[PDB]
Design a protein around this nucleic acid. Structure first.
Ligand SMILES: Nc1nc2c(ncn2[C@@H]2O[C@H](COP(=O)(O)OP(=O)(O)CP(=O)(O)O)[C@@H](O)[C@H]2O)c(=O)[nH]1
Lengths: 208, 605, 83, 99, 62
RNA sequence: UGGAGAGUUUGAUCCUGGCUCAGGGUGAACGCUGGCGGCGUGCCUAAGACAUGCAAGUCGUGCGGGCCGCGGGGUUUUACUCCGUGGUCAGCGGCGGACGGGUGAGUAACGCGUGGGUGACCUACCCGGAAGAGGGGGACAACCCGGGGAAACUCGGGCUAAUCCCCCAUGUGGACCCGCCCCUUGGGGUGUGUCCAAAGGGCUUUGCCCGCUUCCGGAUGGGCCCGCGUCCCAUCAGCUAGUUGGUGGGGUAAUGGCCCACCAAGGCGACGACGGGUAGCCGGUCUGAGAGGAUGGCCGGCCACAGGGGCACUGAGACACGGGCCCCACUCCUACGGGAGGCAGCAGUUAGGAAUCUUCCGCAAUGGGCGCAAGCCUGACGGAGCGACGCCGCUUGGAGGAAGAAGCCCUUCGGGGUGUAAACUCCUGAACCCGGGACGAAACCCCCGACGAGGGGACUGACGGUACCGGGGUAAUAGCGCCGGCCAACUCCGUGCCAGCAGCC
């Protein structure tokens, strides 16, 4: 499956807060906090050299990782950006995002990429028209979705749609905490995506 | 429909009219001519005609008519493999003991009826050969009446049944003095005397595929008696011991010699569904039937006979060789393949990767498997799995278990000799007022081998006794044979030379001939004494001339002395693996090279 | 015979058909004397059929015989309204 | 192990019988003809040329002569009637062969 | 000739098994080799890590 | 809109070159794991051999018949014909068996791709036009009789139908010779002569419909031909008698040495000829930044064989998979004389090997063959099963829960580690349960109206009661390779040139 296991263990692994578990691996405890260093039996072992490889692979890697979606598929879309004119670096970055699942989280609805994907498969999705559960299903030229029917009612629905009702999203994500509904605009673009990384690093890494 | 099935078996033995019973009755069963034997049954049944039973169906009337079935063993032996017929008590509702009016019954038959004596199934006496002259029929009836008077039946008594039969199809019967003909009363002496095995007029399918086989197309054959439900998958099924199972295909009953998938099964009869589950695999132990609801079904029931012939690989020098299967791999494939059909066979794993403890039933039983191995193309030695001297400081701590074999005080002095001569300590000879008398001789696995053979030659079949162990000993201090008249071994590979085998020829007997070119370790006759030697010759030397002539001399030489197997195997004692082949049978010592033998002996101390 | 019949295009459980012409010899899918309109009975597209009326006719001209279901499809099309 | 179709065969029997028979026919008579022309019996040679022409086509009818079968047949025929009958002898009943 | 890998073994003349082939420098002519479990030849008993090659299913850690 | 380099031959240096390695791809196998599904997907070796069960028939609007049922007598009954008819079974008479299904042995070739060619052609089941359809005869099966054989089959006699065969009219034509004019290698009109046309059937019937003959024609499908392009070895040099061509000549739908007689003898070759080795060509496909490598099954197209070898008739069309004659090997049967078999078709067997499924349901959809239609035939197809054999999607879980367990790992024993990892709370909610349930299909047919246009009616899906939707509903599988450098990933112990690992170093 889409990986599983002690992941704030990864919090430690890569560093750049893999708080990513969603909340506390996000506040006072998870490499992002606590022994911030690379975990392991030798995590506190003064590192060594970074093969230009260590480099590219590293970036490519945590990158893919923090999104909970197949390495294969990943590379796939990549290609797409590659075989679909336009700095594939960008195009892809975008594609990365535009994924349903990706979005499931992206819009506060979800608090972690994982719970996000989860819900996605589990229903409570409001595709433009009733719904879809493919924590994959891209997000066509910015569409609408949200706490589907019989969903606007689950305790966690609450936790979320509820504690939520506040903050704003990005320049490509339309947050309507109202009738719990999110709507996409257009290709997110470099800038509007915090999440530090680069691109080149990773694509070259691929080059063959 | 199940209240008309009548499946019975026609016990037998060393003689005299196997089937005979099953066959001939055709009248009845068949078109016209010819053959009418075989009969029936089976494949390579020339020299003899045992093993490979099944089944005796045919919708033959008589008329009478029907009963029905007419669908039971039907099984001789001369068993080989000791029991086998066991799969008969798991269906048959009566036995057809076919004795001879010339001498009566044979010890060989003193089992087929015994193993089921504690029944259960009123045997059906059948005196044959009465068509001849010398063969009192009234006297035989009296003798066959004491077979129970001392063992009970109890309702036998009857034991009536009580037939004589006749060559020209009498058969009597009934009994005396010409039946008809004889193809109109025998039927009555069965039906009217045969009941309808308690079958479940309804419920699920309870067919216990006792036996089982396979065909180069007709897949695997079920083979067994239906206990409940029947019968047209699929409609999966269920197996015993394990799940059993997915589903099923068809089912070829026993209409006489097929093959033909029973249009509709139910019970009583001895149907054998197929197709489901592809005959994968087969174990006359489970109890196929409906989908659970619910296990289980009996019985096992019994197969553990005795005997043991260690197996190995002809890792000798002569190459290479028999056909294409001499290594271990090829052999193994055969071993397991036998642990399927065989019911009286017990394959065991020893120490030597090239050794096996083939535990069969009778001394001859193991032969059937060996004889069939050659014709298939696979040379192997016999037995020959020895024991281990432990444990361990030490001197052979094996076990010791003896058992009398009545007796009939006509062997009390013929059996006490061997045992007493082989250390066979008679821990106790439980006697009785009847006439026989048990004799438990704590014998070890070292003094038990081959014993089964000679034993059957002492009491003449009428003598059974097994063992096991009482406590690991140390072998004592004496050798348990070790056989008399040392075995003549060779001194190298080459060929038999008249001038070589001529010299030392009066020093006993010879095996091979000429130019017979054997090798080292291979035996070529027995010594006039107990000592062993390793002569040689080819050479036969020497040629030639001139000069000159003309006289004289022209030594000849006698030939085997050859055989049997069967007549050479039991000849061993220490380590003379009877290397057999799909067209030949040799016998060499565990150590070919002479000087090599001394390495292991090496005696004290 | 020279006929206008269809072929199946799609996959597993999906069969649109090629409204085409060929000689009743080349497998329902064999090459085809020529392509002419397409149609799908499961529906989906609002555009579940395009049976070129003209070609229908022209071809039709000399002997063009059509599957029966063919003929009905084309007439429907409106290549068969004798007005 | 049974299949009606054999019919075919049997027919071949019938048909083939016939057709040959005829083919023979035209062959042989055409020949005979060729001969008359040869000897010089112009007149009769022609008559033949006739019965000929006739049967050739009769063949035409079915599957014995075909396409241009009968064609060459005739062409050959008449050209010959003439050539043969060209030892100075007059196209007597020059019917079958026009002016 | 080919290499008999796998720590422990057996197989006498009359022993099948097989070669997945594999040169094995340090002993010329070993242009191929066997593969534990092939028909006859069993597997590296009492083994633990890396086992597909030197074939041996995983142990129920019991 | 797209090309990354590392190892490796010294005491260290620079170079040529050899070899090693990375990644990419496959109708793979094997090791080890195996939860759902979807779709592509499935002998690439014995192209050996195969039990068995389906794989092509369909028409009484074609024809006589036999057997069967109904109704109806007939005749008193005797009898058993004859009718009407539902039919059944062949026989006969037509139209399909030449695609549809298989595989690639053979094949170095216009066989193939490609582009042209045909004054040397031919296509029945359809549309186009014009003309025709009027007398006479007759067969062999069916049946009965007769006979040989085990069978196979079967030889001799006797009568009968037809859209079968044959003769005679009528030619709009057509064919041929020959004749001419126009052309232009055997294309077009026509003139004198000769030869050839042709079946009915059924009904609301005097005509409505299936159909029939002659010819010009269309769409169509194919045939022969021709350019260029289509693999290695020259330690394969010299190759050639129908062989180079010519006269005429026979065959064929027509060419042509395709087969013949004569006659002249040239004809071929390094712009590689003769030979040998390899081989189904391609459209296309993996590959590579790239020209270029390789490959070319499952689609699709053209090509060849059908156990191997040969042939020919039936014919619009074959030398013909499930057709026929003859030899080789094979295999089976017998009364030994004598007969039957070819699954490189669907499923399926055994042998081979590393190896490759199912002896399924369904003709409801498409599709194809006979049918005036009703419909009949249809392991083409439509699915269906089974295989990690590939490709796509999906899951065994989310979330909060300690300076932080137990425990095992390291430990300079201070501590460090695996680890929020697990335990816990809420949670969601796969598998699995109840209810409903699909397009997929609308045509051929009813009724209207010229049976036509158009129109309204009628009927029918094995995938499935699954798919799907709804409500239900527990939290539910992980592993496999690597860890000296190339390369990313570190420590304890054993171990101590035994054991061993290696692509290289
Ligand atoms: N005259 C005569 N001969 C007989 C009769 N029964 C058997 N035989 C002969 O004796 C021989 C033995 O009979 P058979 O039944 O074949 O032996 P079996 O019992 O089947 C084999 P086994 O004795 O091992 O059980 C046969 O070859 C047969 O010819 C009989 O009733 N009359």
């Amino acid at each position: 499956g889409r990986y599983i296991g002690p992941v704030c263990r990864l919090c430690r692994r890569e560093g750049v807060k893999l708080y990513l578990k969603g909340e506390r691996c996000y506040s006072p405890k998870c490499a992002m906090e606590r022994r911030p260093y690379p975990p392991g039996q030798h995590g506190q072992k003064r590192a060594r050299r970074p093969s230009d490889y260590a480099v590219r692979l590293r970036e490519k890697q945590k990158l893919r990782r923090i999104y909970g979606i197949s390495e294969r598929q990943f590379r796939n879309l990549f290609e797409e950006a590659s075989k679909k004119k336009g700095v594939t670096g960008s195009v892809f970055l975008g594609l990365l995002e535009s994924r349903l699942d990706n979005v499931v989280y992206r819009l506060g609805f979800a608090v972690s990429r994982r719970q996000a994907r989860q819900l996605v498969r589990h229903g409570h999705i409001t595709v433009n028209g009733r719904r879809v559960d493919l924590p994959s299903y891209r997000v066509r030229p910015g569409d609408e979705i949200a706490v589907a029917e019989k969903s606007r009612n689950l305790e966690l629905i609450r936790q979320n749609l509820e504690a939520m009702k506040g903050r704003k999203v990005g320049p490509w994500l339309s947050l309507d905490v109202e009738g719990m509904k999110g709507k996409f605009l257009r290709l997110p673009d470099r800038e509007d995506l915090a999440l530090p990384v680069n691109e080149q690093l990773v694509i070259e890494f691929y080059s063959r | 429909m199940i209240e008309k099935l009548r499946n019975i078996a026609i016990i037998a033995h060393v003689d005299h009219g196997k089937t005979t019973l099953v066959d001939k009755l055709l009248q009845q069963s068949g078109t016209f001519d010819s053959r009418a034997e075989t009969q029936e049954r089976v494949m390579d049944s020339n020299d003899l005609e045992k093993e490979r039973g099944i089944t005796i169906l045919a919708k033959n009337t008589a008329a009478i008519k029907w009963d029905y079935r007419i669908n039971i063993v039907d099984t001789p032996g001369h068993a080989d493999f000791g029991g086998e017929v066991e799969r008969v008590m798991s269906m048959v509702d009566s036995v057809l003991l076919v004795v001879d009016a010339f001498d009566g019954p044979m010890p060989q038959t003193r089992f087929v009826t015994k193993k089921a004596f504690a029944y259960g199934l009123k045997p059906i006496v059948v005196i044959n050969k009465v068509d001849r002259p010398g063969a009192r029929p009234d006297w035989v009836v009296d003798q066959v009446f004491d077979l129970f008077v001392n063992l009970d039946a109890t309702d036998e008594q009857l034991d009536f049944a009580i037939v004589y039969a006749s060559a020209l199809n009498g058969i009597a019967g009934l009994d005396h003095e010409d039946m008809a003909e004889d193809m109109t009363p025998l039927y009555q002496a069965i039906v009217d005397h045969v009941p309808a095995p308690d079958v479940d007029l309804d419920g699920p399918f309870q067919m216990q595929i006792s036996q089982l086989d396979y065909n180069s197309y007709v897949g695997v054959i079920g083979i067994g008696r239906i206990k409940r439900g029947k019968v047209k998958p699929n409609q999966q099924v269920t197996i015993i011991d394990s799940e059993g199972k997915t589903r099923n295909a068809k089912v070829g009953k026993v209409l006489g010699h097929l093959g033909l998938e029973r249009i509709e099964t139910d019970l009583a009869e001895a149907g054998d569904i197929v197709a489901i589950t592809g005959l994968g695999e087969l174990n006359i132990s489970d109890t196929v039937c409906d989908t659970q609801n619910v296990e289980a079904l009996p019985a096992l029931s019994v197969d553990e006979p005795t005997v043991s012939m260690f197996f190995c690989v002809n890792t000798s020098p002569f190459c290479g060789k028999e056909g294409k299967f001499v290594t271990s791999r090829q052999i193994l494939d055969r071993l397991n393949k036998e642990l399927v059909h065989n019911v009286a066979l017990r394959v065991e794993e020893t120490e030597d990767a090239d050794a096996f403890r083939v535990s069969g039933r009778g001394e001859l039983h193991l032969s059937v498997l060996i004889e069939n191995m050659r014709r298939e193309g696979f040379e192997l030695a016999v037995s020959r799995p020895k024991v281990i001297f432990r444990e361990i400081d030490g001197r052979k701590q094996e076990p010791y278990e003896n058992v009398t074999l009545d007796v009939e005080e006509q062997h009390q002095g013929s059996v006490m000799q061997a045992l007493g001569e082989r250390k066979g300590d008679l821990k106790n000879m439980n006697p009785d007022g009847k006439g026989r008398v048990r004799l438990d001789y704590v014998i070890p696995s070292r003094g038990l081998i081959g014993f089964r053979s000679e034993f059957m030659t002492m009491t003449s079949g009428t003598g059974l006794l097994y063992s096991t162990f009482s406590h690991y000993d140390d072998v004592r201090p004496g050798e348990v044979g070790q056989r008399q008249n040392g075995v003549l071994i060779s001194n190298g590979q080459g060929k038999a030379v008249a001038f070589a085998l001529f010299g030392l020829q009066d020093r006993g007997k010879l095996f091979l001939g000429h130019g017979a070119e054997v090798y080292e370790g291979q035996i070529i006759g027995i010594h006039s004494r107990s000592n062993d030697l390793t002569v040689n010759c080819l050479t036969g030397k020497k040629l030639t001339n001139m000069r000159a002539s003309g006289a004289d001399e022209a030594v000849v030489l006698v030939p085997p002395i050859r055989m049997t197997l069967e007549q050479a195997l039991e000849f061993i004692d220490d380590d003379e693996l009877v290397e057999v082949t799909p067209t030949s049978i040799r016998i060499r010592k565990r150590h070919l090279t002479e000087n090599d033998r001394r390495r292991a002996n090496r005696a004290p101390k | 015979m020279v006929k206008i019949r269809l072929a199946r295009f799609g996959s597993k459980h999906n069969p649109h058909y090629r409204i085409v012409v060929t000689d009743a010899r080349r497998k329902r899918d064999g090459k085809y004397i020529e392509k002419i309109g397409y149609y799908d009975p499961r529906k989906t597209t609002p555009d579940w059929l395009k049976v070129d009326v003209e070609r229908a006719r022209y071809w039709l001209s000399v002997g063009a015989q059509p599957t029966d279901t063919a003929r009905r499809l084309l007439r429907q099309a409106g290549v068969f309204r004798q007005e | 192990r049974n299949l009606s179709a054999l019919k075919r065969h049997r027919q071949s029997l019938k048909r083939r019988l016939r057709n040959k028979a005829k083919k023979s026919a035209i062959k042989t008579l055409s020949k005979k003809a060729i001969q008359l022309a040869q000897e010089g019996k112009a007149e009769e040679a022609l008559k033949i040329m006739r019965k000929a022409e006739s049967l050739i086509d009769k063949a035409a009818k079915g599957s014995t002569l075909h396409k241009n079968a009968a064609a060459r047949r005739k062409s050959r025929l008449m050209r010959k009637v003439r050539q043969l009958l060209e030892a100075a002898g007059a196209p007597l009943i020059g019917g079958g062969l026009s002016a | 000739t080919a290499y008999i890998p796998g720590e422990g073994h057996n197989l006498q003349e009359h022993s099948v098994v097989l070669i997945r082939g594999g040169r094995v420098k340090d002993l010329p002519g070993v242009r191929y080799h066997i593969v534990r479990g092939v028909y006859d030849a069993a597997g590296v008993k009492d083994r633990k890590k890396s086992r597909s090659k030197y074939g041996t299913k995983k142990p129920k850690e019991a």
